Design a protein around this ligand. Sequence first.
Ligand SMILES: [Mg+2]
Ligand SMILES: [Zn+2]
Ligand SMILES: [Zn+2]
Ligand SMILES: [Zn+2]
Lengths: 47, 49, 263, 66, 45, 49, 113
Amino acid sequence: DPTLNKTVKIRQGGYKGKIGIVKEANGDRFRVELHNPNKTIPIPCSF
Amino acid sequence: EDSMIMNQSSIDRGLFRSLFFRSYMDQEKRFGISIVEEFEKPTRATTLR
Amino acid sequence: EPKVNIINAQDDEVELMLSDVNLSLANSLRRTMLAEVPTLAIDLVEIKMNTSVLADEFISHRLGLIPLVSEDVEEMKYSRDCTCEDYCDECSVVLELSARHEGEEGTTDVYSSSLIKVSGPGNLNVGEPVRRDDYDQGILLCKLRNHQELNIRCIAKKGIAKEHAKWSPCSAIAFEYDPHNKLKHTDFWFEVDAKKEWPDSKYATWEEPPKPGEVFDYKAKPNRFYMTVETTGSLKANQVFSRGIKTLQEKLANVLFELENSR
Amino acid sequence: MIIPVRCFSCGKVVGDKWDAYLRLLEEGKQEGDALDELKLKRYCCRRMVLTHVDLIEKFLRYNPLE
Amino acid sequence: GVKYTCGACAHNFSLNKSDPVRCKECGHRVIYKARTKRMIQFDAR
Amino acid sequence: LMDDDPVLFNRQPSLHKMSMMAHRVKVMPYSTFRLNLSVTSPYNADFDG
Amino acid sequence: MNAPDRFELFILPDDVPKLKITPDSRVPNCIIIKFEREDHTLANLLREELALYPDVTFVAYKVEHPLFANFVMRLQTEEGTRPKQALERACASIINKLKTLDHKFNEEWNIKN
RNA sequence: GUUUUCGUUGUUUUUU
Ligand SMILES: [Mg+2]
Ligand SMILES: [Zn+2]
Ligand SMILES: [Zn+2]
Ligand SMILES: [Zn+2]
């Protein structure tokens, strides 16, 4: 999947307005790392 | 039993909040006049493991 | 039944006589104002570049600690509620600070006044940096030296002290009642005597000192309480009082709405 | 190293008063007296500034790389 | 290519992994890299 | 590892059999092991580190 | 690194209701209320108002554990009154008392200035 | 396309 390793930010949800990067995209579900928190969270592709 | 109960908000106000710093080191190594190590972004096709 | 008699009121503080009410209710309302008051503080701190001597996160934290004029925080939505992609002006505010020290000698003391309301859900009187006085630069923010520039762009969002203490609108909120221990709700430690060893409450005047031979009334209950409603400046002690009352009221209304809906 | 923004205990904003507090110090006004001037009654507040140590200048003393 | 800077004279210069690493302007033998070009955030909490 | 699951429990030095036990899992957030305050006696320990 | 989120202290998840009922079979006309996203502020306030009611046999709440934004209460209104009705009664009573104090404080702030 | 790896031995320090 070449749509990874790119800057990604959230449009809606509980962490709306946070920058992040994509690491693992097994399928139809995207896991993203965040900058201010030292944590990585899942989220559907569409958000 | 020496278990401490603290003001949450004071920590929200950063009381006793401390820094950390970690310094690393690296350097290119020489295996010989003609053989050294190279600082690069390795591509998979060239380097392995 | 509930009663109010302001002893001393101010922009920052409201000191009043709340009586004819319950101890539990007074504590709950105090909690409501202290923690259950949504407010606006610097949340998303973003550096275009920096040259100062302090950790970027340290500056960001100190920025969040800044009270902001939050009169219309009642009006602007939470960022989470808004459905717009990314933020919009109706769900967040844009400020900016960008300070530089020029000159090989000296030190440019960056001040909160340097923070400026770039945007915000106008005409909401929000996002304005709070200051003791207009001539008051505000809280000292940073010190920039020779060849030390600072450019930053932050985004604040409406939130509650429960979420983070930066949203605490009230700097402090005291409490008491029955300063004479008429209800005997406390046992007074002493070596010779509590009376001659203990000071007297500032509100002691409002209640007579119990008579020597007076027999204890186990029907005595907490009725008259004493209060001062401090605000960190983001809002008025009267506005804080009213808004905390309204928040408690909305919570109760929602609770009863759930009572009827779940049934 | 700098003045705290607020009072840890209660959260009273304190950073602004520092410069004013320092000015009060300049004339040797007694610690307690100056504290009183600043309308800083709660020793929860008084404590930091009474024993607050400021050392950012020592960082400014260092020649910045740029 | 990449932007660097000296520690003594305070000047930015770019090498291309070919020039031996020495200050291009004051000969100081210690260089450094500069900030990145991506934007930074902070929760300020 | 699901809650209430039996698991071992071992502290040092293990002078006697009561020095160790097995417990039912109760997962919570935060990164410390939480113990009913009575268990300490055989463990002869406090929260001093 | 295992610490829970702060913003969830007040956010109710969709799948769970803000409140949860459960009748207490062990004694007559006694229910159990499971709470979410609430603390002493509402708990004690509702509890005291209800305890002032005469038509209540039993009522008591407790927080199972501070780390979780959820507690429980065991109410028992006497035979005539089912617990839920006395609960909404206390809700309305506190609503009106708070509104009374609100208008009173409006008046007192207005006059004081 | 599945698959897939970092060293030792010492030292000294503290950790109860
Ligand atoms: Mg020990
Ligand atoms: Zn929006
Ligand atoms: Zn204080
Ligand atoms: Zn140079």
